[PDB]
């Protein structure tokens, strides 16, 4: 019998042209289950393993055990090395400054001016952030607000000025406070007959000491990363609190300003701009190859990028880069690597111990990890805990001075990698290297007289990176003749090929509402046509597939279909009633009229002329109750009845939140009244250092004066209004 071998496609087609078949993205992405404490402890152990030949001491600020690999002994093998040499880093930075005059000064000036014009609310632009007040994770705005309230409680008022600099000054002054009073949350627990346990939260005033607060402010909360493709094993990511996020922004901006002006940096360019930049760089490397010579490309990734990069090296880099800046800006840029050099890792949820005979299970948290004899753990967990014990703090946290926990200095690390790329030669040998760096992934282009000198250059680059604490992965890197390589999952074979599978997960129904999902899906198809090699036939098939998935997701099959459903009865009634059936939306059982040419027109606009007047009036009703109408006098919402909102009432089981809801509703009412007074606040962020009450009072007083002088209000109600305003 003839047996099918799919890999035989690669006999007829080069791999790059059919690379999409090597991305199994039509399958379910891996997910993590349960705790991430094992991966976090593994990360701590590995981070300390690459620095154990450094200098070990005890911090006199927090009492944690600190390891310093910088300026340590040079490595003697090919294992990951964290022993960066300060002089070599300085020399690479000096070469970078000599190749690009005035780059560091321009970047420092831009960063300083941006920091001057930066407001506190920038800190609200993050995802889940570690909140030190409750020692939990909370959204960035909530964490920032709790921090500001606590600082108000501790006689710190730098947030009232509105700028980032006074807030950071108040942060580092809070680090000096002998005590910290704040608002924490207590959960009242009830034995509910049904028995179950009912939790009701409430805010209370809590207090911590100086060292405890310092350890909390330096703590990173670790959790597990879900839905990551390409990895067999799961891994833990980390999040920082407000105290660190306040200072990471400026260093990130400085490094971004540097990276924008480097021809070897793959950041912060992305998408088509990144493709154009990489293509131009590759063409330049091809043109500049010496006549009669050879050129090699190394597709490389750096192993243990985050666990080997040391924040002390970043402190040195910031001091070298901001050489010609004022003292205050230099201190400000030095704060962030300093805080990272004393960072403390929260180990996670703990481990669960089970009794199979009795079918019992219990969660042992990180503070109680060593209250259990180590014989009651797995072999792997037992070994990890034994290795962890020296760095373990009796609060359930570990000391993690070495390393960068997870991707906080992508730009600055890219700068370090590009500095490694800028040496270009060692000892005046007969080769020259260049290339591209994006975070840790890199492409190295080495031009020489033959293959042996090219390999000499690659060896020298490997050793030079070793000097900087950068370890090229010999397993995941390879080298060949220039003209074909890989870089950040983009495959170059005489020009970047299209990788269609990478965008496959985006082709589903987005899940905003019926109106938004249609536009998003059509726009996705259009953009994939433009810049992913998606042909017209595949695009039309994608339209069909999107319509099928849309109808099954929103239960809006065609009006003439006999599909049963609660919505389908009314849809069939609308189909029978409606005379102009071609003007009905797909969400109301109408036909799909999208094709390639009209992929950029919204559905309602596209069907507006074919629409029945009665159906058009019902659909585009300015006062339909499915769209939130802004009010303190109702305004007209122009989007149809399909722009509804699934109000996310997150009812996490067995927990009745009655006091968090109270504070949130108080904030919501105050903000809604403020918007009512200041109608522009939702379009432009209001500015001012005065209270919201006084701003609203003056706005109301002016409005009353003006609408009394224009004859919009009588004498009596104006008297009442001025009396109420004076009563405030």
């Amino acid at each position: 019998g003839m047996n099918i071998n799919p890999y035989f496609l690669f006999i007829d087609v080069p791999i790059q042209a059919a690379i999409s078949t090597t991305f199994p993205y039509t399958g379910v992405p891996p997910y993590s289950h349960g705790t991430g404490t094992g991966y976090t402890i593994d990360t701590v152990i590995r981070t300390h393993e690459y620095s154990n030949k450094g200098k070990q001491y005890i911090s006199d600020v927090t009492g944690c055990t600190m390891v310093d690999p910088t300026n340590g002994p040079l490595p003697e093998d090919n294992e990951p090395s964290a022993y960066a040499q300060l002089d070599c880093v300085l020399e690479a930075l000096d070469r970078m400054d000599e190749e690009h005059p005035g780059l560091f000064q321009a970047a420092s000036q831009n960063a300083m001016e941006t920091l001057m014009v930066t407001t506190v609310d920038k800190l609200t632009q993050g995802r889940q952030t570690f909140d030190w007040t409750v020692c939990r994770n909370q959204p960035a705005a909530t964490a920032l607000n709790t921090t500001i309230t606590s600082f108000r409680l501790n006689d710190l008022n730098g947030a009232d000025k509105g700028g980032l600099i006074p807030f950071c000054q108040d942060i580092i002054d809070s680090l000096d406070r002998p005590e910290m009073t704040f608002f924490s949350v207590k959960n009242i627990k009830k034995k509910l007959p049904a028995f179950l346990i009912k939790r009701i939260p409430m805010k209370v005033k809590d207090k911590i000491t100086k060292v405890e607060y310092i350890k909390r402010a330096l703590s990173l909360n670790t959790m597990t990363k879900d839905a990551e493709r390409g990895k067999l094993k799961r891994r833990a990511i980390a999040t920082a609190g407000i105290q660190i996020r306040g200072f990471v922004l400026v260093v990130e901006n400085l490094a971004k300003n540097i990276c924008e002006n480097l021809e070897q940096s793959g950041l912060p360019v992305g998408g088509n701009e990144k493709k154009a930049k990489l293509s131009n760089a590759v063409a330049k490397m091809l043109s500049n190859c010496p006549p009669g010579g050879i050129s090699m490309t190394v597709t490389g990734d750096n192993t243990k990028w985050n666990e080997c990069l040391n924040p002390r090296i970043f402190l040195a880099m910031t001091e070298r880069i901001t050489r010609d800046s004022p003292i205050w800006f230099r201190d400000f840029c030095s704060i962030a690597p300093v805080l990272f050099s004393n960072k403390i890792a929260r180990l996670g949820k703990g481990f669960m111990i089970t009794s199979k005979t009795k079918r019992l299970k219990a969660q042992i948290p990180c503070p109680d990890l060593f209250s259990i004899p180590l014989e009651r753990y797995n072999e792997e967990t037992r070994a990890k805990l034994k290795k962890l014990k020296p760095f373990f703090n009796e609060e359930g946290t570990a000391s993690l001075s070495p390393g960068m926990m997870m991707g906080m200095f992508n730009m600055l690390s890219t700068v370090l990698g590009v500095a490694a790329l800028g040496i270009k030669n060692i000892g005046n040998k007969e080769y020259l290297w260049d290339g591209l760096q994006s975070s840790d992934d890199f492409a190295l282009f080495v031009n020489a007289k033959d293959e042996e000198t090219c390999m000499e250059g690659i060896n020298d680059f490997y050793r030079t990176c070793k000097l900087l604490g950068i370890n090229m992965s010999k397993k995941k890197s390879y080298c060949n003749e220039t003209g074909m390589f890989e870089f950040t999952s983009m495959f170059y074979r005489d020009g970047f090929v299209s990788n269609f599978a990478m965008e496959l997960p985006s082709f589903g129904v987005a899940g905003v509402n019926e109106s938004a999902d249609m536009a998003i899906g059509m726009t996705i198809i259009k953009n994939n046509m433009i810049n992913n090699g998606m042909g017209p036939a595949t695009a039309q098939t994608a339209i069909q597939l999107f319509i099928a998935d849309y109808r099954y997701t929103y239960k809006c099959h065609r009006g003439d279909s006999k599909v049963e459903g609660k919505r389908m009865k009314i849809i069939k009634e609308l189909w029978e009633n409606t005379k102009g059936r071609d003007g009905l939306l797909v969400a109301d059982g109408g036909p799909n009229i999208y094709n390639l040419r009209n992929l950029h027109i919204p559905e309602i606009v596209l069907k507006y002329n074919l629409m029945d007047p009665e159906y058009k009036g019902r659909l585009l009703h300015p006062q339909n109750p499915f769209v939130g109408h802004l009010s303190i006098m109702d305004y007209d919402a122009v989007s149809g009845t399909h722009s509804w909102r699934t109000k996310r009432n997150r009812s996490i089981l067995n927990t009745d939140q009655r006091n968090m809801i109270l504070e949130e509703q108080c904030y919501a009412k105050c903000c809604n009244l403020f918007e009512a007074c200041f109608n522009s606040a939702s379009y432009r962020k209001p500015v001012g250092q005065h209270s919201m009450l006084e701003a609203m009072a003056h706005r109301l007083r002016m409005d009353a004066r003006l609408d009394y002088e224009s004859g919009r209000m009588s004498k009596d109600d104006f008297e009442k209004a001025m009396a109420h305003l004076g009563e405030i």
Partner: protein
């Protein structure tokens, strides 16, 4: 509703928590407390939506009179929650409720939707009133450029647009009256008078206006049509292997037509100057050239402007030339003076060195900027004179700076202090002169300070003017205020009735640019006007299609198979300096292949197009030797004589020819004995393989060390990696 708002504030200030929030939170901290949310937003919203659509009441209803019109039940389908959760809980409904509203709900006015989404209706109008041309299958070379996404009424920077929107919709809570916002004052007024009694929510109107006034520019792959009217249809415009002719609706600006006309004229000149009798070919191509939808001749006649190539095409078509140029905000018309552009390294005030093309010679231009006029005489890297007529002050200084940066003088170059970059973020070149023009519009104070002054002239109707925007005793150097048939020859040179040449074909710029509008060459040889990669691919495909007859003609004849139309198109992308040398080298290689009967089909195909230009040998008669043959544009555009190349590669294992990323099967039109046939017989001119590597001779000889070897001398030549071969002359 001032009284209602004051009552609301009094009611709100009855709680110790609301009072504390209002008193302690500053107006800046409103942007914090409005995002306050104790709960995390649910991740994976597509899964959440698929889960919630299977629930009973996933949708939230706003309480009001319109919600009450929805019945609690309809034919045994519950549409919303019962009266238990009217208060303190929040009412919810099913999607069947939305369908019921669309079917039996109350009917309102669909006005306000038409004005808010007017941009989309204009997009639909452009799509519907559009004409589709034919579809072509063939290589398309797309470049990634930053392009405007959608056409715009008045493109404004986002800060100015934000201020204008703030003026239109929230004049009371606006702030300091920035001067730039007054520039659009009239427009502002119009919009306000159109929104006097609109009950639509202000924020939706604000984003409607922002969509109407703010440009969205993105990096996208394009090929020959970069105007926003074509960018909105980009997905249907072309792919990597096909093109679709599209004629959008609406009205097109004259700038787009002029730019497309210039690009088309330059391409026609580049194709023509390579052919025997370039005038005849240029006229033939121009007579069948369509810009968007109109013929090239009509656009040339109607538009007063262009460049050198436009004037050459105008003369060839029999029209009158208009020696008028553009410098963005400056229109210059030449009077007398011919010069050449040479690229040299020029220092700037910041200390940086930039490769700039500066024009040499003394020339004079009548210059106009808005309502300002003057004359300008310039020399090479030295401004001579600028006479100015009376005009408005800001236009006066704009024309002054435009002319003084047009002169390309050392004072202007060294008066640059700040941050100027001539490279795109994607490492693409920005024209230095235009960048300097843009910079000096907002920072001309440093330029005028660096320029200096002198005593004013004392003529009759002449007075000096200073940067003090007033009649001053002192004036800067060079500025003086004054109150009061061409026949084109065979080689596309413009000569007067006397004999002097005004402009030639060598004067056209070497730049390759994308036209704003789609250019169509209604000729069966349209592909000859494409880019370098497309031309190479089409030429090699033609060679493959006619391979049998070409091989027969070459093995029988000697010279007539070197002259073909496809090769004539191919020669237009070989830089003219090296064309003859390449032709000599390739002809010698092919002849030595034929003479010894060693015939390699891959090498014959690769080197055949280069054997078209007249040969250019050396003094001794031996042709030049090459390792790679460079083509116009881009560092990846070259043909390797021995190895593969980004444009031409050959796999003898599969007998597969990769040309510009496309695979062509050479199997069948080939003898397998050629797999056992030595490559070194067709790598050098007059050289044949002798044997293996000989340590006696030593190193592999380079080209310069090999051209000087006398006949009968052995040498080691490395064909490709790991293939050491010894060769003999």
């Amino acid at each position: 509703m001032t009284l209602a708002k004051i009552e609301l504030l009094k009611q709100l200030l009855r709680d110790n928590e609301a009072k504390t929030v209002l008193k302690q939170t500053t107006v800046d901290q409103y942007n914090i407390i409005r995002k306050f949310n104790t709960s995390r937003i649910e991740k994976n919203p597509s899964l959440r939506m698929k889960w919630a659509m299977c629930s009973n009441f996933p949708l939230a209803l706003t309480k009001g009179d319109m919600a009450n019109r929805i019945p609690l039940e309809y034919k045994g389908i519950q549409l919303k929650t019962n009266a238990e959760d009217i208060g303190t809980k929040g009412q919810m409904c099913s999607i069947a409720a939305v369908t019921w509203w669309n079917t039996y709900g109350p009917i309102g006015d669909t006005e306000g939707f038409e004005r808010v989404y007017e941009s989309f209706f204009l997009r639909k109008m452009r799509l519907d009133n559009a004409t589709w041309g034919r579809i072509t299958f063939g290589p398309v070379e797309r470049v990634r450029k930053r392009v405007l996404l959608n056409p715009l009424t008045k493109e404004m920077p986002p800060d100015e647009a934000s201020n204008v929107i703030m003026e239109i919709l929230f004049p009371k809570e606006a702030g300091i009256p920035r001067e730039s916002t007054w520039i659009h004052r009239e427009l502002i007024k119009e919009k306000r008078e159109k929104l006097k009694g609109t009950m639509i929510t202000p924020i939706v109107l604000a984003y409607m206006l922002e969509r109407e006034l703010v440009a969205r520019r993105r990096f996208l792959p394009v090929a020959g049509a970069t105007s926003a009217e074509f960018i909105e249809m980009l997905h249907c415009l072309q792919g990597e292997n096909w093109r679709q002719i599209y004629h959008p609706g609406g009205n097109k600006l004259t700038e787009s037509r002029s730019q497309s006309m210039i690009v088309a004229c330059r391409k026609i000149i580049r194709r023509s100057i390579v052919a025997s009798n370039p005038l005849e070919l240029a006229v033939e191509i121009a007579n069948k050239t369509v810009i968007d939808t109109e013929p090239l001749k009509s656009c040339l006649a109607a538009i007063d402007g262009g460049d050198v190539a436009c004037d050459i095409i105008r003369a060839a078509l029999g029209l009158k030339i208009r020696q008028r140029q553009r410098f963005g905000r400056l229109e210059l018309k030449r009077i007398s003076g011919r010069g050449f552009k040479n690229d040299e390294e020029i220092l700037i005030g910041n200390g940086t060195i930039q490769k700039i093309g500066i024009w040499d010679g003394e020339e004079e231009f009548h210059v106009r900027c808005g309502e300002c006029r003057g004359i300008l005489k310039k020399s090479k890297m030295k401004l001579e004179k600028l006479l100015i007529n009376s005009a408005k002050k800001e236009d006066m200084r704009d024309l002054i700076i435009l002319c003084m940066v047009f002169s390309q003088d050392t004072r202007m170059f060294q008066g640059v202090r700040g941050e100027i970059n001539f490279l795109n973020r994607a490492g693409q070149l920005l024209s230095p002169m235009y960048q300097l023009q843009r910079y000096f519009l907002n920072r001309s104070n440093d330029l005028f300070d660096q320029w200096g002054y002198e005593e004013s002239p004392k003529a009759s109707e002449l007075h000096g003017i200073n940067e003090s925007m007033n009649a001053s005793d002192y004036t800067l150097k060079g500025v003086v205020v004054t109150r009061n048939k061409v026949s084109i020859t065979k080689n596309l040179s413009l000569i007067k009735r006397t004999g002097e040449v005004i402009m030639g074909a060598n004067d056209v710029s070497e730049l390759e640019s994308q036209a704003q509008l789609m250019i169509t060459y209604d000729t069966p040889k349209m592909w000859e006007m494409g880019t370098t990669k497309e031309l190479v691919q089409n030429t090699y495909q033609w060679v493959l299609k006619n391979l049998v007859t070409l091989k027969a003609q070459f093995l029988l004849g000697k010279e007539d198979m070197f002259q073909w139309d496809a090769f004539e198109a191919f020669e237009s992308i070989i830089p003219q300096k090296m064309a003859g040398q390449y032709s000599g080298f390739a002809r010698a290689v092919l002849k030595q292949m034929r003479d010894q009967e060693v015939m390699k089909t891959d090498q014959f195909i690769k080197l055949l197009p280069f054997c078209f230009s007249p040969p250019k040998l050396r003094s001794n008669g031996e042709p030049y030797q090459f390792l790679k043959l460079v083509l116009k544009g881009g560092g990846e555009n070259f043909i390797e004589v021995r190895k593969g190349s980004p444009l031409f590669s050959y796999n003898p294992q599969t007998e597969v020819l990769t040309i510009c990323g496309r695979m062509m099967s050479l199997k069948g039109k080939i003898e397998d004995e050629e797999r056992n046939r030595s490559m070194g017989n067709a790598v050098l001119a007059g050289f044949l393989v002798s044997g293996k590597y000989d340590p006696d001779l030593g190193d592999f000889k380079t080209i310069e060390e090999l051209e000087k070897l006398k006949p009968g001398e052995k040498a080691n030549i490395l064909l490709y990696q790991g293939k050491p071969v010894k060769v003999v002359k």
